[PDB]
Coordinates of C-alpha atoms in Angstrom, one line a residue:
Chain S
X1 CA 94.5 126.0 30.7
X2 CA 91.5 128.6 31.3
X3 CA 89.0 131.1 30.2
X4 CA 88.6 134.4 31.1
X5 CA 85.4 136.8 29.3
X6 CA 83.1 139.2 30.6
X7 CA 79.7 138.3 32.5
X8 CA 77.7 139.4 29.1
X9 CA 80.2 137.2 27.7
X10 CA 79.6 134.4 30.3
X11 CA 75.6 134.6 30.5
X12 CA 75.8 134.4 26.5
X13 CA 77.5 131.2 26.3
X14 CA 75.4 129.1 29.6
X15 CA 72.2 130.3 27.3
X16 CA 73.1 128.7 23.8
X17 CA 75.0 125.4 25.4
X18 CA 71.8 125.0 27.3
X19 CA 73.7 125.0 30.5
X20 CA 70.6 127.5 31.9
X21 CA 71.7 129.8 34.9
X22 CA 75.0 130.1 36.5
X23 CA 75.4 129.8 40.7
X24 CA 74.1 133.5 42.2
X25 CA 77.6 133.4 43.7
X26 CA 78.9 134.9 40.4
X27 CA 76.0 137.0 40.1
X28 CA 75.8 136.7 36.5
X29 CA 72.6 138.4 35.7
X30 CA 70.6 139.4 32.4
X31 CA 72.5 141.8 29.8
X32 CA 69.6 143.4 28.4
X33 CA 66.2 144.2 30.3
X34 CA 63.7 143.9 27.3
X35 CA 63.5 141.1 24.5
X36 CA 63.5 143.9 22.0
X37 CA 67.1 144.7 22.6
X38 CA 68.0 140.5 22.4
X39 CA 68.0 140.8 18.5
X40 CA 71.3 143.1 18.9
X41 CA 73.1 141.9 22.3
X42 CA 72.7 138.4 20.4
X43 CA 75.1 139.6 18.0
X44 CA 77.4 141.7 20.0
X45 CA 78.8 138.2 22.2
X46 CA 78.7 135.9 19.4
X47 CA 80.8 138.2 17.4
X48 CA 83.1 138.8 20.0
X49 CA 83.3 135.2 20.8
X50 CA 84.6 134.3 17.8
X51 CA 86.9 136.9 18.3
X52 CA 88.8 134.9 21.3
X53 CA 88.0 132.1 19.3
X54 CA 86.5 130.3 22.3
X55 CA 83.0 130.4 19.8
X56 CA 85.0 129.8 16.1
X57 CA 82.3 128.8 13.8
X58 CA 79.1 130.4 13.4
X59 CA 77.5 129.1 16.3
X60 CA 79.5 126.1 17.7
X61 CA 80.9 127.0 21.0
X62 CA 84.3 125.0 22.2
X63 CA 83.6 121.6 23.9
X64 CA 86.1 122.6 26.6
X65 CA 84.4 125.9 27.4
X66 CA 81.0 124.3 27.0
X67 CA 81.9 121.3 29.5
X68 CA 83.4 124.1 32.0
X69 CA 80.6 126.1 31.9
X70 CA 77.9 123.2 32.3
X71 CA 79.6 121.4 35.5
X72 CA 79.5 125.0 37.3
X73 CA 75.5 125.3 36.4
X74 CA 75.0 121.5 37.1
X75 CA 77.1 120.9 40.0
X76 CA 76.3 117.9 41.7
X77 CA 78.9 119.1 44.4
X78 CA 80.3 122.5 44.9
X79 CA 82.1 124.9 47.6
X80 CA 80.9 128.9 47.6
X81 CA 84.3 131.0 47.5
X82 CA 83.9 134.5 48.8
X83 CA 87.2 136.4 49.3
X84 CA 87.8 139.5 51.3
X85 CA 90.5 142.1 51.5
X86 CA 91.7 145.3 50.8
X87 CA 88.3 144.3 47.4
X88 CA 86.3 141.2 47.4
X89 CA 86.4 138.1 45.0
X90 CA 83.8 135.5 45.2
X91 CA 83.6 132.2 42.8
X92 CA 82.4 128.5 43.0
X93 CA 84.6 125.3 43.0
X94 CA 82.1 123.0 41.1
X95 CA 82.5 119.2 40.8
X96 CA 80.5 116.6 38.4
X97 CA 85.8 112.9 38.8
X98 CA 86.6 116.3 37.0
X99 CA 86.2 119.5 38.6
X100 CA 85.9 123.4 37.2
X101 CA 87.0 126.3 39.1
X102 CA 85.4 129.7 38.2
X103 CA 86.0 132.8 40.2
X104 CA 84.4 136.4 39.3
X105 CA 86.2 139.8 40.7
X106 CA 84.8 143.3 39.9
X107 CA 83.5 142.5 36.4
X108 CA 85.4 139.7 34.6
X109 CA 84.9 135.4 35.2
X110 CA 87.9 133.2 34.4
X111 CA 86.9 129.1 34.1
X112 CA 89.6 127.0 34.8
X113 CA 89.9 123.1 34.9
X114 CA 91.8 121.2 38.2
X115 CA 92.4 118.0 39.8
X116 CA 91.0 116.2 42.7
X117 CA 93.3 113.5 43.0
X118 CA 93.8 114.1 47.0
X119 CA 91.9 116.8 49.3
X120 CA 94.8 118.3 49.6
X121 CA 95.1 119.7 46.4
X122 CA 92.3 122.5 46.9
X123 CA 94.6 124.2 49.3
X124 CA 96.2 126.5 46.7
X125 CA 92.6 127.3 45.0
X126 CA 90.9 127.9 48.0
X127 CA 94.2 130.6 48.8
X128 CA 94.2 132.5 45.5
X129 CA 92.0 135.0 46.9
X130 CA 94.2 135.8 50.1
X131 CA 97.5 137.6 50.3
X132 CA 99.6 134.0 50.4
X133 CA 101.3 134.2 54.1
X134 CA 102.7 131.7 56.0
X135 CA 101.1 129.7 58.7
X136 CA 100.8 131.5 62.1
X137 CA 102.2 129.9 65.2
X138 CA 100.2 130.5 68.3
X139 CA 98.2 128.2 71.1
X140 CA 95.5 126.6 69.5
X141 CA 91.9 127.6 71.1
X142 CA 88.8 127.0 70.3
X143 CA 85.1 129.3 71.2
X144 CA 81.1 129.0 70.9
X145 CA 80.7 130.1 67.6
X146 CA 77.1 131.0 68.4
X147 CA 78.7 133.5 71.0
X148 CA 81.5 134.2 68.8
X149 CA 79.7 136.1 66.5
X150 CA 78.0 138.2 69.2
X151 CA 81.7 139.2 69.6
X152 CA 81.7 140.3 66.1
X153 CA 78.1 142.4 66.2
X154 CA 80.1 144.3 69.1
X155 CA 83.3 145.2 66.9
X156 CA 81.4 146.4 64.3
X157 CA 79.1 149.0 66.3
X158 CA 82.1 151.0 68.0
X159 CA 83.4 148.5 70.9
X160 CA 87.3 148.8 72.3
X161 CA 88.8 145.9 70.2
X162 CA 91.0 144.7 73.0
X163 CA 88.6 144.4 76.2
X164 CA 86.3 142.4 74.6
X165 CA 88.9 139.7 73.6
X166 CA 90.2 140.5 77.1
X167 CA 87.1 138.3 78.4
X168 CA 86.4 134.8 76.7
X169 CA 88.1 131.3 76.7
X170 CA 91.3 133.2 75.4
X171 CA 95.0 132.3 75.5
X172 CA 97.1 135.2 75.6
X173 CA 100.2 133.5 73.5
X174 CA 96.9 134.1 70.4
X175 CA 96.2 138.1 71.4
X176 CA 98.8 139.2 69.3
X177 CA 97.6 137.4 66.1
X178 CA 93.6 137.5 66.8
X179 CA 94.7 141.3 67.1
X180 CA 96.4 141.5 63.8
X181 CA 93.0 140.0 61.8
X182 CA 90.8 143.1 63.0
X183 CA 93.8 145.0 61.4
X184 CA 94.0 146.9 57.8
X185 CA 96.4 144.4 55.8
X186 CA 94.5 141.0 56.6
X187 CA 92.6 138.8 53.9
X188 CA 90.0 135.6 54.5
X189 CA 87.7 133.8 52.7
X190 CA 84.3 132.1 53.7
X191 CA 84.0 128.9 52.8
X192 CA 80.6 127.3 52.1
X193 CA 80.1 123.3 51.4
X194 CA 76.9 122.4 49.2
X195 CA 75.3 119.5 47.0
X196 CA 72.4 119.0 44.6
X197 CA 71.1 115.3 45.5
X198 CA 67.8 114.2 44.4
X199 CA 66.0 117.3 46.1
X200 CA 67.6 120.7 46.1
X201 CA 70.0 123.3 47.1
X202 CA 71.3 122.7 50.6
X203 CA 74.7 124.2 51.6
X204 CA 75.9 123.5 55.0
X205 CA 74.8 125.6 58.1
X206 CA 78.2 126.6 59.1
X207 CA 81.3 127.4 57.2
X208 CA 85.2 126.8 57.0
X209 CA 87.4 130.1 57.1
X210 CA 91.2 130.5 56.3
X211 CA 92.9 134.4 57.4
X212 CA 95.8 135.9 56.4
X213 CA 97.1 138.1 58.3
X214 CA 100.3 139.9 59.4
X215 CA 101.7 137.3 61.6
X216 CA 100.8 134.5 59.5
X217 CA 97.7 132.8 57.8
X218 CA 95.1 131.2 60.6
X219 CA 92.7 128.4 59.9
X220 CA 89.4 128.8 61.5
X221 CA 87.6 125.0 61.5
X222 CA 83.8 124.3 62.8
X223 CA 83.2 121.4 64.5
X224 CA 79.6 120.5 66.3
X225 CA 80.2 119.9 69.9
X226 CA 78.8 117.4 72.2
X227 CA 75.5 119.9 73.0
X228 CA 75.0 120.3 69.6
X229 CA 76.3 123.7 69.1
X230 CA 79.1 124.8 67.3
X231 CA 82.2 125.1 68.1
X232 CA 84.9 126.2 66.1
X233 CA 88.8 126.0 66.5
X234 CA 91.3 128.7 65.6
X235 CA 95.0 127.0 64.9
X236 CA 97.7 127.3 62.4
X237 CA 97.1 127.7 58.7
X238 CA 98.6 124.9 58.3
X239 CA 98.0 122.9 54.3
X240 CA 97.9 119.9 55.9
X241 CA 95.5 121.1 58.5
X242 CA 92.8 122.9 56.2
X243 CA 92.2 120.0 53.9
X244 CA 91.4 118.1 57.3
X245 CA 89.0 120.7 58.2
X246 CA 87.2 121.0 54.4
X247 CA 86.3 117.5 54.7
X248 CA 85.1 117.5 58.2
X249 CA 82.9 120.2 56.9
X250 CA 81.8 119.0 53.9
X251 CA 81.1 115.5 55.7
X252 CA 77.8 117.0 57.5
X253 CA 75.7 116.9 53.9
X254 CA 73.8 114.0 53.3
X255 CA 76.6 112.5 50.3
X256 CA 79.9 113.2 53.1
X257 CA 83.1 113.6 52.1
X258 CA 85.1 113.7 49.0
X259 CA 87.1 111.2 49.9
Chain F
X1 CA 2.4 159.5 17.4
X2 CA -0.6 157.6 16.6
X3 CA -3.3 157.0 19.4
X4 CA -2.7 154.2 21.2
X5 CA 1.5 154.3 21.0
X6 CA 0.9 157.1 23.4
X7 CA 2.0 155.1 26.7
X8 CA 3.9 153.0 24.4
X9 CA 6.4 155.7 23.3
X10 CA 6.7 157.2 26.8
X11 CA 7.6 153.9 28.1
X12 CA 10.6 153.3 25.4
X13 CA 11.5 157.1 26.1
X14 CA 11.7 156.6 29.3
X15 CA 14.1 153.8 29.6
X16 CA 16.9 155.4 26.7
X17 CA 16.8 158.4 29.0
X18 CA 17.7 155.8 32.3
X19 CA 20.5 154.2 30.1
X20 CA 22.0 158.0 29.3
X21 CA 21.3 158.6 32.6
X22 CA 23.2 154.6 34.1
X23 CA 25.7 155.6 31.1
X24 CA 26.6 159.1 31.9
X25 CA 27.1 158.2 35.7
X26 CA 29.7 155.3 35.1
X27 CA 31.0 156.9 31.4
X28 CA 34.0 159.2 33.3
X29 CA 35.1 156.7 35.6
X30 CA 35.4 153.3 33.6
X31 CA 37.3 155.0 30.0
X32 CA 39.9 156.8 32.6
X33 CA 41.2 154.5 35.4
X34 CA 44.9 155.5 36.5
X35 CA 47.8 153.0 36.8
X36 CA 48.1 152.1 40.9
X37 CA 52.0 152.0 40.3
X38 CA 54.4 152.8 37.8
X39 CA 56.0 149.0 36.7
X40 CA 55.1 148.5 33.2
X41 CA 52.6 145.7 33.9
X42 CA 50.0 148.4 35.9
X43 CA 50.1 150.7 32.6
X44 CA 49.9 148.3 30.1
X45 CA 46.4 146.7 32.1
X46 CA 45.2 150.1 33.0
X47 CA 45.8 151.3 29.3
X48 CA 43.8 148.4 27.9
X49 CA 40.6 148.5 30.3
X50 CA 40.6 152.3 30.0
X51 CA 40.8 151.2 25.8
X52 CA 38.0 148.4 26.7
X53 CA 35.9 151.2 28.6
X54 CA 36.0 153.7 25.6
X55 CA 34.8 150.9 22.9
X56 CA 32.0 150.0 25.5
X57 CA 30.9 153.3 25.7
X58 CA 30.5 154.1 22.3
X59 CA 29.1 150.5 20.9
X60 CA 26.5 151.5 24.3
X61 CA 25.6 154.8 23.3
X62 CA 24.8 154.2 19.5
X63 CA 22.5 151.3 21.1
X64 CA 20.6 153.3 22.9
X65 CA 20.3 155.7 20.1
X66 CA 19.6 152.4 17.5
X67 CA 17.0 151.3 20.2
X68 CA 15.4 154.5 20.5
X69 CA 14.5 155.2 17.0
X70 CA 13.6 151.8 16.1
X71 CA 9.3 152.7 15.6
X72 CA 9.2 154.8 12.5
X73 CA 5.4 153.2 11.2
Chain A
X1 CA 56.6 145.9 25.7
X2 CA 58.4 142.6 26.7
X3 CA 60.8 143.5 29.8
X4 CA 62.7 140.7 31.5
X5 CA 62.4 140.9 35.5
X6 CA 65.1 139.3 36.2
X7 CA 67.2 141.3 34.1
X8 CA 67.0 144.5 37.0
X9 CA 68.1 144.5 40.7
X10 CA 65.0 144.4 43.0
X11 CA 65.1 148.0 44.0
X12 CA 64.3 148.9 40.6
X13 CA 61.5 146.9 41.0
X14 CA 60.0 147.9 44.0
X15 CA 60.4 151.6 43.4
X16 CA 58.4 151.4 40.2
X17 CA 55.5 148.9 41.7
X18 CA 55.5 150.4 46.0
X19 CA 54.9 153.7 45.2
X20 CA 52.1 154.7 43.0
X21 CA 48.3 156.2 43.2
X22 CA 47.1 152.9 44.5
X23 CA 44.1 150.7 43.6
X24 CA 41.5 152.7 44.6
X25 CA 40.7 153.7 40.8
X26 CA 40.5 150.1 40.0
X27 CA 37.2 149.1 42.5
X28 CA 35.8 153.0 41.5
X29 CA 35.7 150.9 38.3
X30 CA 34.8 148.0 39.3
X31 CA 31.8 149.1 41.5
X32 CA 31.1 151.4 38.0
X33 CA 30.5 148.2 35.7
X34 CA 28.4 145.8 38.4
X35 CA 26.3 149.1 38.9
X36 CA 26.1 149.7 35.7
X37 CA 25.2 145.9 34.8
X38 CA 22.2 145.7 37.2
X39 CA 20.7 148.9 34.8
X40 CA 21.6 147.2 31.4
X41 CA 19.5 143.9 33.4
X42 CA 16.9 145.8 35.0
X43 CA 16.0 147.8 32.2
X44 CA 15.7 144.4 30.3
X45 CA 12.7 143.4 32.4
X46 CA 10.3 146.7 31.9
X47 CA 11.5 146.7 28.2
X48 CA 10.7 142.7 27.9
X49 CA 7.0 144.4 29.5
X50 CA 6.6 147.1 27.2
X51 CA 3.0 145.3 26.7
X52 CA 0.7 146.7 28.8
X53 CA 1.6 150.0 27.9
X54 CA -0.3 149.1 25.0
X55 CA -4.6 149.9 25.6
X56 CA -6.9 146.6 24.8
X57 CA -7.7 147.9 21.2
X58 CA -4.6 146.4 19.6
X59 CA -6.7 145.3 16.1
X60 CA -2.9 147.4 13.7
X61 CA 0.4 148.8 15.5
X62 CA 1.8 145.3 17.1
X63 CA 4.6 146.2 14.9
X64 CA 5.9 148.9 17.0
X65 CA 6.5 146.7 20.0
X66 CA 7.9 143.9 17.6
X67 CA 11.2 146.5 16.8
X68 CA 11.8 147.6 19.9
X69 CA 11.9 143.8 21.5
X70 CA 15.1 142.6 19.4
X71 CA 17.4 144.7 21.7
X72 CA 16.1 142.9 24.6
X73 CA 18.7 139.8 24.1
X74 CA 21.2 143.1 23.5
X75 CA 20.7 144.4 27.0
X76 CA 21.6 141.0 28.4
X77 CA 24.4 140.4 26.3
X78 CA 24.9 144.2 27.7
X79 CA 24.6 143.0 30.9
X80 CA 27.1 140.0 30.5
X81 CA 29.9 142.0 29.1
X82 CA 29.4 144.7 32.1
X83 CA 29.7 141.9 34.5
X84 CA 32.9 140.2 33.5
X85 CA 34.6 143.5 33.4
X86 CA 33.5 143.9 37.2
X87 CA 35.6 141.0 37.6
X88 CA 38.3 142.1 35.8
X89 CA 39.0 145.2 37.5
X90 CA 37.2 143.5 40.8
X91 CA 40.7 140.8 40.2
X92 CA 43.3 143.2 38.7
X93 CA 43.4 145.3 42.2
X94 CA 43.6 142.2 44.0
X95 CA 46.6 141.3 41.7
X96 CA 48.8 144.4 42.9
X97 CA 47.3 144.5 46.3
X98 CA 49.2 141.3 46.8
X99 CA 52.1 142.1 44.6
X100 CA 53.2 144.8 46.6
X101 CA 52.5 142.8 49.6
X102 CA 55.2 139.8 48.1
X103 CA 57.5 142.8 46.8
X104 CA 60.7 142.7 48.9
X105 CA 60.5 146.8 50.7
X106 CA 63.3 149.1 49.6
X107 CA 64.3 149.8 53.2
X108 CA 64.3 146.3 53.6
X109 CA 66.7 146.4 50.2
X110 CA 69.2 149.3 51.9
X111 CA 69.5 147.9 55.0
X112 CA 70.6 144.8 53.0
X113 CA 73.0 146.9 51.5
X114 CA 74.7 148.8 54.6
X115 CA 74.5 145.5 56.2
X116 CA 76.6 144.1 53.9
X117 CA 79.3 146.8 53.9
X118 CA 80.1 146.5 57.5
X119 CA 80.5 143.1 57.6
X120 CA 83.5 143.2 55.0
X121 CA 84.9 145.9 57.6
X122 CA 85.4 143.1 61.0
X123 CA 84.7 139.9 60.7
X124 CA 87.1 137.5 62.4
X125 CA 85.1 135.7 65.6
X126 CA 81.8 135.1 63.7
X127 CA 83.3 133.8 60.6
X128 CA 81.5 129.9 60.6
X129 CA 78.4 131.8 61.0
X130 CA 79.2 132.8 57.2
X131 CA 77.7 136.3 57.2
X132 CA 79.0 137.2 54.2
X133 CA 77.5 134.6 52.4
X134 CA 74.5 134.6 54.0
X135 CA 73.4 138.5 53.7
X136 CA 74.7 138.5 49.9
X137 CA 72.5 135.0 49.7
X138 CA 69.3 137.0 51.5
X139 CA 70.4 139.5 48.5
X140 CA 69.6 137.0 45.3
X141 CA 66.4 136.0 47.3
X142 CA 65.2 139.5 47.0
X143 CA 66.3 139.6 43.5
X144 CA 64.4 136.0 42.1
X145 CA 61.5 137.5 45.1
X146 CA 61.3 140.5 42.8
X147 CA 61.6 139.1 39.0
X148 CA 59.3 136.0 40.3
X149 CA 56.3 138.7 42.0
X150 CA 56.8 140.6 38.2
X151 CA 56.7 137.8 36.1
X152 CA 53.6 136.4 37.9
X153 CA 51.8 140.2 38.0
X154 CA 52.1 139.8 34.4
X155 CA 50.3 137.1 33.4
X156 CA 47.7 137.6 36.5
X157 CA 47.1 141.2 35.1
X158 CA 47.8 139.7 31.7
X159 CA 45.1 137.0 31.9
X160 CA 42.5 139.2 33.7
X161 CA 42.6 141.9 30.6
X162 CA 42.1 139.3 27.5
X163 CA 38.2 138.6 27.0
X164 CA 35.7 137.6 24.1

């Protein structure tokens, strides 16, 4: 029960429902670059529209696809998707009772309908984009994210991985999987809460992160910490856990949880 | 030139020759002004003063012409 | 003819618009018309005077001075036109100058890019500081930065070219 097109496909159709202009997550731009070249690009998606026969008639475009592609314009609540591995995959899990998930990889957009009848339901969407492990089993432990991605700037500019891991608030019953995440077959997603209430777009300032890796998937929750900061906890991947950690997230906008 | 217009006719003559003179010094500079970039908004502009600057100067130079030649008693 | 900015990335943008002759052509032009108005009004004033000239036997050849005193309400009309397009010119370089002030840099658009690239490669410890999502989200702001400065040059430059 989906849709998959094209971006000139997908742009085409949020112009004539009147939807207006998808999230820049699925950075679904402009076909054509003068209004001189509309008269022709006009015909080019309706005709192949009505070849899928999403868009049968001459201009009437399916209900289904046209309520899809509306509640991921004009979300009223939404979490950013942006996968990683090796390849990246990036949609939007918008909500309006109903929700719409739509996910983009190198060039096509697939619209799907889901359920939100308990958090815990979003595990498997918000996994689609990794490489499906099982939960990891090490000592849970938790770090400054504010000095945590310090760590990071240092691994990226040519730093020993293992000396610098060597030195923080680490367990060494973790080294072994915290090692296999800086590794070639690992996948994770960022995970980024939002809502459009009377004013305008805020997301949150943080996000929630789950890793797959070679020993096992990781689940890596924020929390803000008695001084304010941010702390965030790394402990097993568990489906139970992550819904736990979405809402704990998603909680810190103004309109709090789902739930 | 009759007798009196002497002045008269040196005074018109020599304000059509300060116009030439006004229109000559501004004439190269205002019908050829280059775009400062290349997006398509500086050469559309640049193309339509250097199109308002070329009807100026001819409308101008007729004028002064028209102006010029206007005592013929 | 009728380009949409939003339509192109920002570099694409700021190529076409950051590097250029520049808007010194646009005040030589400006300076050209308001030097070229104070003539078209100062010229108004001896012609307006062109009695005087005339000796105190005038009995006869009044006529003369009669043709030539028409054009002196053309020379301020003259004068008007040559004016406004002072302004025009005087407000289209001011139009780019801050264009290309607002317009996002292109080594500010690569290091965006290489940014981004190296992030995919290690991220694990700074992963709730979302830098993925955050440097592809400082990406779209230079795009709608771009398309907005364009679409606004447009009708600034637009509006300071249509007249009478």
């Amino acid at each position: 029960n989906a849709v998959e097109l094209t971006v000139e496909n997908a742009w085409f159709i949020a112009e004539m429902v009147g939807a207006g202009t998808f999230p820049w997550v699925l950075a679904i731009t402009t076909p054509y670059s003068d209004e001189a070249q509309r008269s022709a690009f006009f015909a080019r998606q309706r005709d192949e529209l009505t070849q899928l026969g999403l868009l049968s008639s001459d201009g009437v475009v399916n209900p289904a696809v046209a309520e899809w592609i509306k509640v991921v314009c004009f979300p009223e609540r939404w979490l950013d998707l942006r996968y990683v591995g090796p390849d990246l995959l990036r949609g939007i899990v918008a909500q309006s009772f109903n929700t719409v998930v739509a996910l983009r990889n190198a060039q096509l957009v697939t619209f799907t309908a889901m359920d939100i009848d308990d958090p815990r339901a979003l595990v498997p969407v918000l996994g689609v984009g990794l490489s499906a492990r099982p939960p990891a089993r090490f000592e849970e432990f938790s770090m400054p994210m504010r000095v945590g991605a310090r760590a990071d700037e240092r691994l990226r500019s040519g730093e020993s991985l293992d000396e610098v891991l060597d030195y923080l608030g680490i367990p060494v019953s973790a080294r072994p999987v915290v090692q296999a995440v800086f590794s070639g077959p690992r996948s994770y997603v960022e995970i980024v809460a939002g809502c459009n209430r009377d004013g305008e777009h805020t997301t949150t300032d943080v996000g929630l992160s789950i890793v797959d890796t070679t020993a096992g998937r990781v689940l890596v929750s924020p929390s803000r910490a008695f001084d304010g900061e941010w702390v965030s906890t790394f402990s097993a991947g568990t489906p139970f856990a992550t819904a736990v950690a979405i809402d704990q997230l998603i909680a810190n906008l103004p309109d709090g949880q789902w739930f | 030139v009759p007798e009196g217009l002497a002045a008269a006719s040196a005074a018109v003559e020599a304000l059509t020759a300060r116009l030439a003179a006004a229109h000559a010094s501004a004439a190269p500079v205002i019908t050829a002004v280059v775009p400062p970039a290349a997006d398509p908004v500086s050469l559309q502009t640049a193309a339509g003063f250097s199109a308002q600057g070329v009807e100026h100067a001819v409308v101008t130079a007729e004028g002064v012409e028209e102006l010029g030649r206007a005592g013929v008693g | 003819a009728a380009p949409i900015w939003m339509a192109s990335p920002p570099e694409v943008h700021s190529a076409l618009l950051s590097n250029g002759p520049g808007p010194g052509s646009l005040v030589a032009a400006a300076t050209a018309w308001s030097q070229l108005s104070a003539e078209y009004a100062s010229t108004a004033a001896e012609l307006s005077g062109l009695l005087g000239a005339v000796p105190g036997w005038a009995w006869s050849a009044e006529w003369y001075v009669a043709a030539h005193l028409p054009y002196v309400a053309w020379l301020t009309q003259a004068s008007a036109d040559a004016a406004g397009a002072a302004a025009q010119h005087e407000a289209a370089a001011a139009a780019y100058t801050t264009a290309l002030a607002a317009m996002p840099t292109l080594a500010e658009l690569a290091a965006n890019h290489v940014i981004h690239t190296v992030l995919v490669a290690t991220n694990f410890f700074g992963i709730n500081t979302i830098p993925i999502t955050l440097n592809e989200a400082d990406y779209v702001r230079m795009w709608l930065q771009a398309a907005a400065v364009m679409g606004l040059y447009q009708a600034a430059s637009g509006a300071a070219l249509a007249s009478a």
